[PDB]
Design a protein around this motif. Structure first.
Motif, mmCIF file in Angstrom:
data_model
loop_
_atom_site.group_PDB
_atom_site.id
_atom_site.type_symbol
_atom_site.label_atom_id
_atom_site.label_comp_id
_atom_site.label_asym_id
_atom_site.label_seq_id
_atom_site.Cartn_x
_atom_site.Cartn_y
_atom_site.Cartn_z
ATOM 1 N N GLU A 8 2.800 -3.592 -17.582
ATOM 2 C CA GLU A 8 2.255 -4.500 -16.580
ATOM 3 C C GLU A 8 3.121 -4.569 -15.328
ATOM 4 O OE1 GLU A 8 2.072 -8.188 -18.592
ATOM 5 O OE2 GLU A 8 0.314 -7.685 -19.806
ATOM 6 N N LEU A 9 4.441 -4.685 -15.493
ATOM 7 C CA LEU A 9 5.289 -5.141 -14.395
ATOM 8 C C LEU A 9 5.389 -4.100 -13.285
ATOM 9 C CD1 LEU A 9 7.165 -7.390 -13.386
ATOM 10 C CD2 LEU A 9 9.061 -6.180 -14.476
ATOM 11 N N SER A 64 2.290 -3.647 -10.556
ATOM 12 C CA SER A 64 2.157 -4.523 -9.398
ATOM 13 C C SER A 64 3.036 -4.034 -8.254
ATOM 14 C CB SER A 64 2.508 -5.959 -9.785
ATOM 15 O OG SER A 64 3.847 -6.053 -10.235
ATOM 16 N N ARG A 91 -2.390 -7.499 7.455
ATOM 17 C CA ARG A 91 -1.397 -7.599 6.390
ATOM 18 C C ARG A 91 -2.025 -8.115 5.094
ATOM 19 N NH1 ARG A 91 3.952 -9.365 9.962
ATOM 20 N NH2 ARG A 91 4.035 -7.366 11.090
ATOM 21 N N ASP A 92 -3.296 -7.765 4.928
ATOM 22 C CA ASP A 92 -3.977 -7.841 3.648
ATOM 23 C C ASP A 92 -4.205 -6.416 3.170
ATOM 24 O OD1 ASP A 92 -3.951 -10.572 3.685
ATOM 25 O OD2 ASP A 92 -6.038 -10.810 4.325
ATOM 26 N N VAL A 93 -3.675 -6.126 1.980
ATOM 27 C CA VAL A 93 -3.522 -4.746 1.531
ATOM 28 C C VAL A 93 -4.875 -4.042 1.491
ATOM 29 C CG1 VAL A 93 -1.530 -5.451 0.210
ATOM 30 C CG2 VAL A 93 -3.717 -5.307 -0.928
ATOM 31 N N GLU A 116 -8.068 -0.266 -1.297
ATOM 32 C CA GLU A 116 -9.467 -0.189 -1.675
ATOM 33 C C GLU A 116 -10.322 0.501 -0.624
ATOM 34 O OE1 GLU A 116 -7.769 -2.769 -0.892
ATOM 35 O OE2 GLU A 116 -8.817 -3.866 0.693
ATOM 36 N N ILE A 142 -21.558 1.422 3.241
ATOM 37 C CA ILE A 142 -20.453 0.560 3.653
ATOM 38 C C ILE A 142 -19.385 1.352 4.403
ATOM 39 C CG2 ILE A 142 -19.306 0.722 1.370
ATOM 40 C CD1 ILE A 142 -19.359 -2.336 3.746
ATOM 41 N N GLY A 188 -20.052 1.894 7.682
ATOM 42 C CA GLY A 188 -20.722 0.781 8.309
ATOM 43 C C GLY A 188 -22.202 1.001 8.521
ATOM 44 N N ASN A 206 -17.053 3.297 12.832
ATOM 45 C CA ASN A 206 -16.285 2.392 11.988
ATOM 46 C C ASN A 206 -15.991 3.032 10.639
ATOM 47 O OD1 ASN A 206 -14.944 0.025 11.246
ATOM 48 N ND2 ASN A 206 -16.809 -0.892 10.399
ATOM 49 N N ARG A 220 -14.979 2.260 7.146
ATOM 50 C CA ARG A 220 -14.718 1.254 6.130
ATOM 51 C C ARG A 220 -14.188 1.841 4.833
ATOM 52 N NH1 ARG A 220 -19.991 -2.760 6.877
ATOM 53 N NH2 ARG A 220 -19.602 -3.274 9.076
ATOM 54 N N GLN A 253 10.665 -7.186 -3.755
ATOM 55 C CA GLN A 253 9.582 -7.325 -4.718
ATOM 56 C C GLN A 253 9.984 -6.739 -6.065
ATOM 57 O OE1 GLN A 253 6.487 -9.012 -3.928
ATOM 58 N NE2 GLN A 253 6.703 -9.064 -6.161
ATOM 59 N N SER A 292 12.134 -9.641 -7.430
ATOM 60 C CA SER A 292 11.203 -10.715 -7.765
ATOM 61 C C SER A 292 10.367 -10.370 -8.990
ATOM 62 C CB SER A 292 10.297 -11.006 -6.572
ATOM 63 O OG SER A 292 11.051 -11.457 -5.463
ATOM 64 N N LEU A 293 9.963 -9.106 -9.118
ATOM 65 C CA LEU A 293 9.298 -8.678 -10.340
ATOM 66 C C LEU A 293 10.306 -8.453 -11.462
ATOM 67 C CD1 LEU A 293 6.749 -6.070 -8.885
ATOM 68 C CD2 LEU A 293 6.278 -8.443 -9.503
#
Lengths: 508, 514, 509, 517
Positions: D69-70, D73, D178-180, D183, D311, D314, D355, D357, D491, D494-495
């Motif tokens: 898991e660790l 992230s 600054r939103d990853v 995706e 999408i 666009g 665009n 996306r 990070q 922190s992780l």
């Protein structure tokens, strides 16, 4: 998952290629020994195998480290040829070399460049005694010939060696800038001939003529057909099922015998007396096609007219429906050549052209199998001998020269890794060592002396470990294209340092 | 057959077994109090700060072990808090009584001293019972912010408390009409401004599913008409599967398109039924979601059902089991449907809701291992913050009262006894185990501290008690560490009961045999 | 094995078997009893005071004790306090033979000792009756005996279950000069308190009360274990979700398929339906249409209790029920039985003989422990009605008999001399039991109970007073057993003892 | 079952924690020696990547649980940093034994690890506060993609990959948002290409091409007809696919199915587009009609890709053929069928200069192991690059940061007289294990090797230069350009730092033993 820590991992890294390498190092090197494959997991069998993969793949390769080379050494053989036995032993050598250095408590990373840089300067010293033999075509002939005979060696080939050293170079001397596997057409059958093979003028084809068909065809203009008939000819109406019961089960076979006859309509439209097609017909069909009076040849081979169209200058095409979708092929004769008890329908439009058919007659497939590979291997080493006509002294003499230099280098070159370069250089003279006792000869003096001896400039003089003697690598003909030797150096040097740097192995 | 054992070998086995499993619960409670991650079966692993849950989850094979479950499970239902302590306590007598049963001497009465001093126990703590609400401030809600700050810092956040403490009081005042632990329910958001809780009296939604219409399907309504849908729609809708043919003669391109329009209808069954926001708990087809994007009726696929239940409670809606809206009551409404990415992924905020009864915090954690104990700290406050409301009468936390309660009974260990000073001392011994369990599970010596506390109680005092950070001497009242008075009483009865209960049984019958 | 040889069945098995059965009573008898958890083939904790209750679930291999458990069940039905006493009494009676076995006295010899002495003791039991009391009505006075009989059988509220079962046993009856087997049944219901328990005379269905309320005064039932999904003679309907269209026809048909049912119910007559099985969706909605009360999805408990109290009998099928299959109750009504709102009938003279004490608590075992009590409050009150005689509470009569049967041993002389001395000893393990629950020696009890040397009242029971063993007057304490209780509890404990005391080795192939 | 507590659990936790730190420590960094790992399947995976090792390990315990898991992230957001976060968690746990063995309760040290985890990430903060814009950071993006492409040993000349990761992050993930976005970055690749065969596709490449090259390779700006509709076998999800069972059926369907596609491919062009993207493709029969009707269009588009090309471009959604309309179309700046340099890798690109996306990095390679060699390497690059293109905060890696931390940490550790005076100091000791285990892998004695950096820190007291991370003998953090995003290193901690302490707060475990995962 099963966590394999470095203790057995390096150990298993060592055992995998060594436990197979010992088997192929018999076969490989000069010949004092081979592998006789004693075959039972699958059967009751006794086999004689000079082929690495036939040793590799037949036996359980299940070691994850042996997976690497059995996968990696085959490709090296699948690439430049005769790389199975090579990449296996040579890395298995390094596994021994690593093992000491491992047991000497040495970073595999410290061992990496120590070999990896030593791999270069050896390939460099390999390039030294690599001696371009392209001078004339007769030189290029005998270069290729010495090289063709080089890869064929240490393997069981009965009549193969002397004919293909002609053919392989023949396939080379026609294409001029490469060799021809595109041209040589390997035709295998039972002819009763031991290994006996020949360059086939045109291409022979195997069928019995009978029923009403006269057997020989004279002044034959072939009608090239990429689509023949299997049993029923395929078109809109070609399929039906009438069966409501067990009688119709026997009565449905009778219904499809009608479909053999409508095939005549297509070929009678084309009008050519000689119709050569890919799809075979049977003897009861031969009644309907032979009574038609036109000659419809079944199973006429693609690569066969591909031979013709190249040499005859004509066009062999694809997608045959009406006569002109393939340019009409021109042969002098469609004939039946009788080899022993065989009856072979034989298309001769041309003789020994820049596309040749090669008829391989043998009572055993395995020899014909290992004969193809060594041929498949040589032409590749010959096609690179077209490119690099350096034939570098083989039989371990190359190992020596590289072992001497790299040792000289490791002396000066690093301040630490002189460990691995000489260790590398040690693995070089290894392959020489295992086979001299196999002639009974003392490798030690040899690898000591003859290395230094010819690494003091006798480089032509080299290892005959078939005789266990010191003899000229060029004059003994023991030598091969600078690539394949460096190519069999590339993977094996790479094959070892992979599992060398592998300190853990997960097993699910 | 049936197996049974009477007498002490049963009772020793009784008291022994009851001591065994409640052990695991001992070490668990606190800020530094160990968390118990229990693995039942195999892929099943469960963390709890409360024993009653794991008491049910742990195997209790004994009348001694089983009787431990419900007793703290009672306390689990009482305050929602204090399971582990009640599990710690009921069996605490057993080792304290252990010499008494190992001396062999237990008049079946000796159980009665448990209840006896439990009277005085449930007395003094309601005798020292003090309202936090009435006196603190006037609003009483900044007390709730004090109780927030203390009960937000009771688990993780000393730093995030003040920012959340207003928000806790916000939801507590909002949530308290009908109180339900989920109706303050926090919706995680990660990647925005971290260490920030944002309360909305409406409800934010985790799951919304759209592509080809991901961001080009309308995400905003200044009133959503919300079909709360458990329905599943697929690539295409109902058509006859039995005796059907594709590729036939004329049906090749007809039946595919016929499958299409029936899907449009069943997808439109939601749309024209007065559903602006389509919340579909079950999958929507790929091109089916495109049709939601095609009809400008917002689609959320695979919505969390609680978001549908938080809907009906906040939004005045109800879950619709069919695509065509059954009524406008089951149709969810809000005066705002906003879809806003905090951290960069789509959330459905139902806000401005007609009922708006389910509060939602929007919480941003610092990291992976860090984030949850914050969210736990949030729910901890709202419980005992509302419990500071729930019971006005409150006692100093951190085992402050139990300290002198040891004296008070060891006074009666002095005072009354013909004999039972043993009993009275054994009882009073059970009191301070928890702050001893607390400070020591942190790793700081409680005995010293506890003794000094009682040494400081000795001069005079009651509320002297451990503040648990450095877990040492303090006044939990002065330290603002509180749980209400009755909360102790709630533990006092239940745990002191199970002692009485298991011991009066020296004989356990099991009919299946074995 | 249940097959044995080697004199175990004679000089071993019996004394082993007895204290196994017994030494619940020793902590389970007297002014209270200490509950003992029982688990069944169903896993759960069942606390026990009454002897026959812990032994009912206890499954014995003992060829010996299988005689005696019945005697407790005999004793239970009879009186209900003293079943505990019976086990611990015979605990003293039999073992004393071991000495006479070491002393060498034969089998029938010492048995004749306890026998003629239990004949001698039964003779004295009416003499040792101490006062008396009863009311065919009064709760409080009757409660005290019903209190003190369930004392042994209850550690819980003594006065509260005293007043309920006294109410219940009495006020279910126009007389209570007559008293019967079930005059009281129980709907065990949680919530509120255990002392929230209430006596409601009638048949309580703690089950749902459904159908539109039609009758209140008419509680007459056509009782059915037959589910109503449409189950009726011509077509037995069930609920089948197999296909959607067939469900559409059910709702249509069921309204009519339920029609001929509650019809035939109210045809043979009733406005209240006891359905021991299911009732379907449109079946109940038709009962809402038909205007009949369907009390649905009942238990076999609520099925039988009615079938017991109204004399009617459940129908598994639907045929028109007879009056043998249809009972009538005073009134059907919705009222809370200990604060629980469901259908609670009224039963006095219509069919009757059911009081409902709602057994309460936070769990079923609290309702099982108050089950322990009122069962004796049922039983002892019948004895109370049979004889209002009061006799010193258990153990206060013993010290009397021991003195009497002592010198009776020296009126005996001959090998029963000692056996009657031993029978004089057979009495006194009872206060020992009482004092052993109190944990104190009866050796102090014995001498103090012999201190004044009359024994009409003085005893040491289960108290914090007994924590230092202290003479209290069970007579004056309100602990007064009934003569028959004092007669029965001696009789069978002596009866079941002597017959198991002549047993020999088991013969088996 | 069973309940194991305290030392039992203490030996239940660090035990499963200790070994997997070891497989990664000789896998650590570029000199981390790769691990051949073989399934029960006959598989082989040569893995120095912890996440790949963790993906390779199903090994059983809450630790092995938390471990798989660790890292992952760290591996998505930051990418590189996957290895250190675990191995150091073990090193922290490796300490807590002896440190509880000193008689310091596991929660007595617990804060001290996190308390001193502050100074490290705080010291990391000090390293490089630099933040550079996309066109400026692109060199530091590839300069870090020197390193973050480096560990997989696909890095140089892969500045293609390094540069295509520069724009791929920027295209979809903004610098300001600054939103990853991993995706809306489409990670794409195919066997038969080459590592040096590398492209960033801005729009959507659809694998299949127009039904013929005999119709143009090129669809103009937009005009993409988004279609769920069979021109080949539909295989509908409502009913089942069956084909013609009779002889007269191949007669009529051949005659029927042609003229409709004639009409429909014209009806597509009637609705209009130069490109019809069909979820259910053109058949070879429908191919010649797309030729015959004289329309370009794509045959096969993925069921999801019919949303993707909608999408990601666009392009306004056209659900199906029956929903065809002019104003709604898939969009393109242009449409091409692009040969990538190896005709084996051949896609029809619907490319977005309008665009994007979903931006498509299209890697190539001789085979799958080689493209994945690139992709996870490109990922971690693309990861750190995106992190850097958000905030270019960097740090000199190889532990010279932590060697500079640990000294400052353990010092500031002592400052609090609370027993974590000592306990925080031992925390700093763990900060030194990663460059240690790296110096092992480097072929160097880490002990002395770190003290070189220690001395270099005694010199510098921040990383600028350093020791080897790659094995050369030029010992530098800056000039060797061993550099990590300042973000993920914090990070990592922190992780790494809390999971230990979190496992410290949870030692109370109902298990018969560790293996319950």
């Amino acid at each position: 998952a099963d966590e394999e820590r470095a203790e057995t991992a390096r150990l298993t890294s060592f055992i995998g290629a060594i436990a197979i390498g010992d088997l192929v190092k018999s076969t490989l090197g000069p010949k004092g020994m081979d592998k006789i494959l004693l075959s039972s997991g699958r059967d009751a069998s006794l086999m004689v195998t000079n082929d690495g993969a036939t040793i590799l793949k037949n036996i359980g390769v299940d070691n994850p480290a042996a997976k690497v080379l059995v996968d990696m050494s085959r490709v090296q053989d699948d690439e430049v040829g005769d790389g199975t036995t090579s990449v296996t032993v040579l890395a298995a050598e390094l596994l021994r070399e690593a093992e000491s250095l491992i047991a000497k408590k040495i970073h595999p990373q410290t061992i990496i460049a120590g070999w990896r840089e030593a791999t270069k300067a050896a390939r460099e010293a390999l390039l030294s005694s690599a001696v371009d033999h392209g001078s004339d075509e007769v030189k290029f002939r005998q270069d290729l010939m010495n090289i063709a005979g080089t890869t064929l060696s240490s393997k069981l080939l009965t009549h193969h060696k002397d004919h293909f050293t002609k053919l392989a170079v023949e396939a080379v001397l026609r294409l001029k800038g490469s060799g021809n596997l595109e041209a040589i057409h390997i035709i295998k059958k039972l002819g009763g001939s031991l290994a006996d093979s020949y360059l086939d003028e045109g291409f022979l084809l195997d069928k019995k003529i009978g029923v009403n068909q006269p057997k020989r065809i004279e002044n034959a203009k072939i009608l090239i057909a990429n689509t023949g008939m299997d049993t029923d000819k395929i078109k809109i109406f070609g399929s039906r099922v009438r069966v409501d019961s067990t009688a119709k089960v026997a009565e449905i076979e009778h219904a499809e015998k009608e479909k053999m006859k409508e095939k005549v309509e297509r070929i009678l439209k084309h009008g050519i007396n000689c119709f050569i097609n890919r799809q075979l017909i049977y003897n009861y069909p031969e009644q309907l096609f032979g009574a038609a009076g036109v000659m419809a040849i079944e199973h006429a081979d693609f690569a066969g007219v591909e031979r013709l169209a190249l040499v005859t200058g004509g066009e062999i095409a694809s997608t045959f429906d009406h006569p002109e979708l393939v340019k009409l092929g021109s042969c002098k004769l469609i004939e039946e050549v009788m080899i022993g008890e065989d009856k072979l329908i034989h298309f001769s439009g041309v003789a020994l052209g820049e596309a040749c058919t090669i008829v391989l007659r043998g009572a055993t497939q395995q020899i014909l199998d290992e004969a193809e590979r060594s041929l498949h291997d040589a032409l590749c080493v010959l096609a690179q001998t077209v490119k690099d006509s350096r034939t570098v002294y083989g039989g371990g003499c190359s190992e020596m020269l590289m072992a001497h230099a790299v040792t000289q280098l490791a002396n000066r070159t690093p301040g630490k890794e002189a460990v691995a370069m000489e260790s590398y250089a040690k693995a070089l003279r290894m392959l020489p060592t295992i086979i001299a006792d196999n002639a009974g000869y003392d490798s030690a003096d040899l690898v000591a002396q003859l290395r230094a001896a010819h690494s003091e400039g006798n480089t032509t003089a080299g290892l005959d470990m078939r005789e266990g003697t010191i003899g000229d690598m060029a004059i003994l003909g023991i030598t091969e294209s600078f690539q394949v030797k460096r190519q069999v150096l590339l993977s094996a040097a790479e094959a070892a340092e992979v599992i060398l740097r592998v300190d853990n192995i997960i097993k699910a | 057959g049936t197996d049974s054992s009477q007498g002490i070998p049963q009772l020793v086995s009784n008291i022994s077994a009851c001591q065994v499993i409640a052990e695991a619960v001992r070490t668990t409670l606190g800020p530094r109090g160990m968390d118990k991650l229990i693995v039942d079966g195999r892929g099943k692993a469960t963390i709890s700060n409360d024993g009653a849950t794991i008491l049910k989850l742990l195997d209790v094979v004994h009348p001694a072990a089983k009787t431990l479950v419900d007793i703290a499970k009672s306390q689990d239902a009482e305050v929602g808090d204090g399971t582990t302590s009640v599990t710690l306590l009921a069996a605490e007598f057993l080792k304290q009584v252990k010499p008494y049963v190992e001396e062999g001497l237990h008049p079946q009465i000796i159980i009665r001293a448990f209840r006896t001093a439990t009277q005085l126990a449930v007395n003094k703590i309601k005798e020292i019972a003090v309202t936090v609400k009435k006196a603190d401030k006037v609003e009483q809600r900044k007390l709730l912010e004090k109780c927030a700050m203390t009960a937000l810092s009771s688990k993780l956040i000393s730093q995030q408390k003040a920012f959340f403490a207003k928000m806790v009081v916000d939801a507590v005042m909002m949530l308290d009409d009908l109180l339900q632990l989920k109706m303050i329910g926090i919706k995680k958001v990660q990647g925005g401004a971290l260490e920030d809780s944002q309360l909305v009296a409406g409800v934010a939604f985790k799951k919304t599913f759209s592509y080809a219409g991901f961001e080009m399907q309308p995400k905003k309504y200044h009133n959503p008409k919300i079909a709360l849908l458990n329905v599943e729609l697929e690539l295409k809708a109902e058509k006859d599967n039995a005796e059907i043919r594709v590729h036939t003669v004329e049906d090749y391109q007809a039946i595919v398109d016929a499958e299409w329009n029936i899907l449009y209808d069943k997808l439109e069954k939601i749309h024209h039924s007065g559903a602006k926001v389509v919340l579909s708990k079950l999958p929507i087809g790929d091109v089916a979601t495109q049709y939601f994007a095609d009809r400008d009726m917002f689609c959320a696929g695979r919505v969390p059902e609680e978001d549908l239940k938080r809907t009906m409670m906040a939004c005045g809606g109800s879950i619709q089991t069919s695509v065509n809206a059954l009524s406008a009551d089951v149709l969810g409404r809000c005066q705002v449907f906003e879809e806003t990415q905090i951290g960069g992924e789509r959330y459905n905020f139902f806000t401005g809701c007609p009922k708006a009864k389910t509060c939602t915090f929007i919480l941003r954690g610092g990291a992976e291992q860090f984030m949850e104990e914050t969210e736990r700290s949030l729910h901890d406050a709202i419980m005992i913050v509302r419990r500071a409301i729930k019971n006005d009468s409150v006692v100093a936390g951190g085992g402050a009262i139990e300290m002198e309660l040891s004296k008070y009974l060891r006074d009666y260990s002095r005072t009354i006894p013909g004999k039972q000073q043993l009993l009275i001392g054994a009882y009073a011994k059970a009191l301070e185990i928890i702050p001893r369990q607390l400070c020591d599970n942190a790793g700081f010596d409680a005995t010293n501290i506890l003794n000094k506390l009682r040494a400081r109680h000795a001069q005079g005092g009651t509320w002297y008690g451990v503040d648990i950070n450095n877990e040492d001497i303090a006044d939990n009242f002065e330290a603002f560490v509180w749980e209400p008075a009755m909360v102790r009483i709630n533990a006092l009865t239940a745990a002191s009961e199970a002692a009485c209960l298991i011991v009066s049984v020296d004989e356990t019958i099991k009919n299946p045999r074995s | 094995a249940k097959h044995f040889s080697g004199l175990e069945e004679a000089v071993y098995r019996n004394i082993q078997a007895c204290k196994e059965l017994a030494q619940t009573t020793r902590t389970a008898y007297g002014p209270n009893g200490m509950n003992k958890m029982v688990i069944n083939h169903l896993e759960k904790l069942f606390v026990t005071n009454d002897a026959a209750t812990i032994l009912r679930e206890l499954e014995v291999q003992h060829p010996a004790a299988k005689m005696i458990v019945m005697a407790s069940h005999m004793q239970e039905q009879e009186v209900g306090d003293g079943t505990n006493f019976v086990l611990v009494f015979a605990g003293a009676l039999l073992e004393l033979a071991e000495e006479l076995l070491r002393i060498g006295l034969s089998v029938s010899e010492v048995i004749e000792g306890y026998e003629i002495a239990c004949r001698k003791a039964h003779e004295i039991l009416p003499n040792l009756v101490c006062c008396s009391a009863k009311n065919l009505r009064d709760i409080d006075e009757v409660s005290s005996l019903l209190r003190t009989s369930i004392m042994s059988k209850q550690y819980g509220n003594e006065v509260f279950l005293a007043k309920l079962i006294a109410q219940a046993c009495v006020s279910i009856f126009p007389d209570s000069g007559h008293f019967n087997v079930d005059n009281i049944r129980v709907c065990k219901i949680l919530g509120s308190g255990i002392s929230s328990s209430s006596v409601l005379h009638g048949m309580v269905f703690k089950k749902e009360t459904e159908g539109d309320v039609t009758s209140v005064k008419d509680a007459k039932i056509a009782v059915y274990s037959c589910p109503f999904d449409g189950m009726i003679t011509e077509t037995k309907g069930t609920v089948l979700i197999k296909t959607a269209e067939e469900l559409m026809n059910f709702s249509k048909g069921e309204e009519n398929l339920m029609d001929a049912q509650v019809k035939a119910i109210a045809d043979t007559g009733a406005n209240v339906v006891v359905t021991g099985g299911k009732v379907a969706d449109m079946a109940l909605h038709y009962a809402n249409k038909y205007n009949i009360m369907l009390v649905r999805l009942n238990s076999k408990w609520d099925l039988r209790r009615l079938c017991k109290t109204v004399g009617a009998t459940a129908l598994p099928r639907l045929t028109p029920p007879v009056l043998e299959e249809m009972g009538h109750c005073d009134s059907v009504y919705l009222s809370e039985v200990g604060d629980t709102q469901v259908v609670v009938f009224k039963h006095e003279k219509e069919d009757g003989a059911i009081s409902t004490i709602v057994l309460r608590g936070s769990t079923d075992n609290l309702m099982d422990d108050i089950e322990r009590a009122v069962d004796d409050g049922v039983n002892t009150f019948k004895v109370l009605t049979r004889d209002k005689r009061l006799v010193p509470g258990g153990g206060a009569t013993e010290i009397e008999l021991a003195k009497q049967i002592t010198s009776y041993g020296e009126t005996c002389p001959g090998l029963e001399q000692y056996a009657i001395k031993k029978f004089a000893e057979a009495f006194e393990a009872i206060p020992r039991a009482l004092a052993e629950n109190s944990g104190v020696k009866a050796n102090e009890v014995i001498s103090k109970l012999y201190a004044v040397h009359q024994e009409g009242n003085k005893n040491v029971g289960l108290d914090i007073e007994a924590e230092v063993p202290a003479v209290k007057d069970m007579l004056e304490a309100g602990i007064l057993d009934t003569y028959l209780g004092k007669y029965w509890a001696i009789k069978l404990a002596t009866n079941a003892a002597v017959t198991v005391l002549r047993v020999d080795q088991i013969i088996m192939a | 079952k069973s309940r194991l507590m305290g030392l039992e659990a203490l030996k239940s936790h660090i035990m499963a924690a200790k070994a997997v730190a070891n497989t990664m420590r000789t896998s650590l960094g570029p000199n981390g020696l790769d691990k051949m790992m073989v399934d029960k399947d006959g598989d082989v995976t040569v893995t120095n990547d912890g996440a790949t090792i963790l993906s390779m390990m199903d090994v059983d315990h809450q630790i092995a649980k938390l471990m798989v898991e660790l890292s992952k992230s760290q591996d998505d957001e930051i990418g590189d940093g996957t290895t250190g976060v675990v191995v150091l968690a073990g090193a922290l746990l490796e300490e807590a034994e002896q440190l509880l063995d000193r008689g310091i309760h596991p929660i007595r040290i617990a804060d001290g690890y996190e308390q001193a985890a502050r100074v490290a990430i705080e010291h990391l903060d000090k390293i490089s506060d630099s933040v550079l814009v996309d066109i400026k950071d692109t060199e530091p993006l590839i300069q870090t993609a020197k390193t973050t492409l480096g560990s997989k040993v696909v890095n140089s000349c892969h500045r293609q990959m390094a540069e295509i990761a520069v724009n791929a992050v920027l295209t979809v993930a903004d610098m300001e948002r600054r939103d990853v976005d991993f995706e809306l970055i489409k990670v794409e690749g195919k066997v038969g290409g080459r590592l040096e065969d590398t492209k960033l596709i801005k729009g959507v490449i659809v694998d299949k091409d127009f039904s013929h090259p005999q119709m143009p390779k090129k669809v103009e700006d937009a005009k993409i007809a988004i279609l769920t509709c069979p021109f080949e076998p539909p295989k509908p999800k409502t009913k089942h696919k069956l084909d013609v069972t009779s002889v007269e059926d191949y007669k009529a369907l051949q005659k029927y199915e042609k003229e409709k596609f004639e009409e429909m491919i014209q009806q597509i062009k009637e609705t209009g587009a130069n490109l019809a993207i069909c979820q259910w493709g053109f058949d070879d029969e429908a191919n010649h009609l797309l030729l015959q009707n004289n329309l370009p269009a794509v045959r096969w588009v993925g069921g999801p890709e019919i949303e993707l090309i909608a999408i990601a471009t666009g392009g306004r959604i056209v659900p199906r053929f029956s929903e065809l309309t002019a104003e709604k179309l898939g969009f393109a700046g242009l449409v091409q069928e692009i040969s990538f340099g190896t005709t084996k890798d051949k896609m029809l690109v619907i490319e977005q200069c309008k665009n994007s996306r979903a931006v498509t990095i299209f890697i190539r390679g001789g085979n799958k192991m080689i493209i994945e060699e690139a992709k996870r390497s490109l990922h971690d690059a693309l990861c750190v690059i995106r992190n850097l293109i958000r905030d270019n905060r960097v740090v000199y890696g190889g532990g010279a940061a932590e060697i500079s931390c640990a000294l400052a940490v353990s010092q500031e550790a002592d400052k609090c007289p609370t027993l974590e005076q000592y306990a925080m100091r031992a925390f700093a000791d763990a900060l030194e294990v990663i460059p240690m285990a790296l110096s092992e892998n480097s072929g160097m004695n880490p002990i002395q090797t770190m003290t070189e950096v220690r001395a270099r820190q005694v010199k510098e007291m921040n990383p600028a230069l350093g020791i080897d991370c790659l094995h050369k003998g030029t010992n530098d953090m800056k000039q060797q350009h061993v550099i990590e995003t300042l973000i993920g290193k914090k990070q990592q901690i922190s992780l790494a730092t809390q999971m230990v302490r979190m496992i410290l707060k949870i030692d109370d475990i109902r298990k018969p033993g560790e293996s319950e995962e």
